[PDB]
């Protein structure tokens, strides 16, 4: 019954907030804003730094293609933005149950699509017609 432990979970008096999709909603769009503002704030920093590297320029140093350097750098903040987005999306929809003592990996994977154990409709069994594998299977999936 090793497989039993994909339903391992110690549940406190109250269900983890995370099981509730709306809480994850909050926290997600919370970080989405938090991210949107970082986005601008970085345009600033990378703006000052543009002009800031012009004044540290010797005449023996090669000129800066602002058009080039500025491109790559915005594009990058854009990427890094999206990156950060999907990443928070990850931590609040996909992987929020990752190693949580208070969420069985079964719960987790299910809840992330807005489902509970009650939505689990069909179980396909190994059920190999052997005496013991069929007791056991039922027993495991049942305890689960």
């Amino acid at each position: 019954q090793g497989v039993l432990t994909t339903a391992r979970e110690k549940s406190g008096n109250f269900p983890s907030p995370l099981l509730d999709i709306k809480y994850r909603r909050r926290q997600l769009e919370l970080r989405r804003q938090q991210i949107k503002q970082w986005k601008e704030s970085e345009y600033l920093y990378l703006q000052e730094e543009v002009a800031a590297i012009k004044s540290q320029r010797s005449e023996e140093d090669g000129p800066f293609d602002e058009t080039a350097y500025l491109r790559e750098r915005t594009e990058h903040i854009e990427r890094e933005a999206r990156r950060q987005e999907a990443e928070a999306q990850t931590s609040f929809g996909n992987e929020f149950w990752r190693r949580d003592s208070r969420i069985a990996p079964l719960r987790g994977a299910l809840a992330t699509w807005g489902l509970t154990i009650d939505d689990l409709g069909v179980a396909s069994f190994h059920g190999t017609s052997t005496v013991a594998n069929d007791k056991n299977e039922s027993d495991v999936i049942c305890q689960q």
């Binding site: 039993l4 432990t5 979970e9 110690k10 003592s101």
Partner: peptide, 29 residues
């Protein structure tokens, strides 16, 4: 774990082993 405990031990992700009187590592009953 004694067989008695097994299902429980499997299902509770906190359950851990305590050193015992005979030096032995066991789960707690």
């Amino acid at each position: 774990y004694e067989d008695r405990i097994q299902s429980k031990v499997f299902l509770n992700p906190q359950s851990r082993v305590t050193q015992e009187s005979n030096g032995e590592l066991k789960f707690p009953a």
